[PDB]
């Protein structure tokens, strides 16, 4: 099982400068609830921007360096090698690796952030005739979370 795990927001932005854009605790909680337990793989920008891999899961880079090693991470140098990956693997990021990926995923759980931020990376454009909705939730806003969002389980049609 191959899944991609993203937040986007209206025009697909992820990114500014290495950061997410925006700060909604309950996506972090949605990532740990998915993701514990399985695998992450992401780019080697992407695992930069963390700063250190993320707890009770494995987590997978992809990177050309062959010098890149890090204590809690396993290292692939090549897209085929995620194919190699038992259990649960969810494609983490960033936009080079989704947009390597989108076609070969199984399913998306998308976070979609119901706002417009700058960016300087995005999700691939994809259209929902070739995806079913398995789910679409909405998320609950509260003093923590303040910017509408809604929980998608995309699957391949
Ligand atoms: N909103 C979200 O759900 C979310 C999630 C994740 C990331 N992001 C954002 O996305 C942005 C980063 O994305 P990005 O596109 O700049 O970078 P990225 O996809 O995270 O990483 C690109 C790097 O991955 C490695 N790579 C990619 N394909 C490879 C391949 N086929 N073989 C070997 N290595 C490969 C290369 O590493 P080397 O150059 O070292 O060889 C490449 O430089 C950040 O702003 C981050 O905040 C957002
Ligand atoms: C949470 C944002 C997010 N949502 C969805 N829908 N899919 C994704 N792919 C990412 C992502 C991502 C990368 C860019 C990233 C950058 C960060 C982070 C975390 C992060 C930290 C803790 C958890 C909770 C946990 O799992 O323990 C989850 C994510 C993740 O924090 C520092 O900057």
Do not use: C
Not at 53 to 77: A, C, K, Q
Not at 79 to 84: A, G
Request: zero cysteines; proline letters at 5%; glycine letters at 8%.
């Amino acid at each position: 099982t191959l899944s991609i795990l993203v937040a986007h927001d209206l025009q697909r932005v992820i990114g500014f400068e290495n950061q997410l854009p925006w700060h909604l605790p309950n996506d972090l909680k949605h990532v740990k609830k998915l993701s514990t337990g399985h695998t992450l793989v992401m780019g080697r920008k992407t695992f930069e921007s963390i700063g250190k891999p993320l707890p009770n899961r494995r987590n997978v880079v992809l990177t050309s360096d062959t010098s890149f090693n890090v204590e809690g991470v396993d290292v692939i140098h090549s897209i085929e090698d995620i194919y190699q990956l038992p259990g649960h693997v969810f494609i983490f990021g960033g936009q080079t690796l989704f947009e390597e990926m989108i076609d070969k995923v199984d399913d998306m759980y998308i976070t979609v952030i119901e706002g417009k931020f700058r960016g300087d990376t995005f999700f691939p454009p994809y259209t929902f005739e070739d995806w079913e909705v398995a789910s679409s939730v909405e998320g609950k806003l509260d003093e923590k979370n303040t910017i509408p969002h809604t929980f998608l389980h995309l699957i391949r049609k």
